[PDB]
């Protein structure tokens, strides 16, 4: 188990383990605040030379953004982070789940697998598909603190 660090911009990773390097692009949306929201955009390299942009699950968006409560305090309400076991990549969303998002609180970790669907019309060819949601053991100020609990048994089924 490795959490996967990402460089600003293009990261060449082989998310679907087929020998062609894909892109994970790490960028931020700058709309002029102290803590711009970082977003991840996934592009799967196709053998025909095209790049297939992956959707956000349960969304019409194609970039996975972090979320912060307002312009102001330095903590995350929602975060995303990539993990890898051997050749397999997993995307994990950490989210503060209590009503008072400002306080130290419970955090849910949603584990997504890479899923290829080749088959049903109108379904994405390449998507992140939920495998497991767990509640972190500790309460935290910032969602990203929960990733310190992620281990091999939590990612796999």
Residues that bind a second copy (CB under 8 A): 8-10, 23, 25-33, 36, 39, 41, 43, 45-46, 49-53, 55, 60-63, 71, 117-126
Minimum gap (Å) between residue 39 Cβ and a second copy: 6
Cβ distance to a second copy smaller for residue 17 or 133: 17
Strands 64-65 and 78-85: unpaired
Cβ distance to a second copy smaller for residue 17 or 70: 70
DSSP reduced 3-state for 2 = strand
Cβ distance to a second copy smaller for residue 26 or 134: 26
Minimum gap (Å) between residue 126 Cβ and a second copy: 7
Give the Cα separation of 44 and 133 in Å (integer).
25
Q: Are 153 and 137 in contact (CB under 8 A)?
A: no
Q: Are 43 and 23 in contact (CB under 8 A)?
A: yes
Q: Are 15 and 89 in contact (CB under 8 A)?
A: yes
Q: Are 65 and 77 in contact (CB under 8 A)?
A: no
- The 4-33 site mask, x for binding Na ion (CB under 5 A), equals ----------x-x-x-x-x-----------
User: Of Na ion, a second copy, none, which one sits near residue 47, judging by CB under 5 to 8 A according to partner kind?
Assistant: none
Give the Cα separation of 117 and 29 in Å (integer).
30
**Residues forming the site for Na ion (CB under 5 A):** 14, 16, 18, 20, 22, 45
């Amino acid at each position: 188990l490795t959490p996967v660090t990402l460089k600003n911009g293009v990261n060449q990773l082989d998310i679907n383990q087929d020998g062609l390097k894909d892109y994970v692009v790490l960028a931020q949306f700058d709309n002029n605040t102290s803590h711009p929201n970082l977003g991840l955009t996934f592009f799967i390299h196709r053998p025909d030379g095209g790049y297939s942009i992956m959707p956000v699950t349960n969304s019409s968006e194609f970039t996975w953004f972090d979320y912060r409560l307002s312009a102001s305090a330095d903590f995350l309400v929602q975060d995303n982070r990539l993990f890898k076991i051997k050749k397999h990549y997993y995307l994990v969303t950490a989210r503060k789940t209590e009503e008072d998002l400002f306080d130290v609180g419970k955090v849910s970790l949603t584990i997504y697998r890479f899923k290829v669907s080749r088959d049903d019309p109108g379904v994405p060819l390449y998507e992140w598909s939920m495998s497991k949601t767990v509640t972190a053991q500790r309460s935290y100020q910032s969602a990203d603190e929960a990733y310190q609990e992620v281990d091999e048994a939590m990612l796999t089924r």
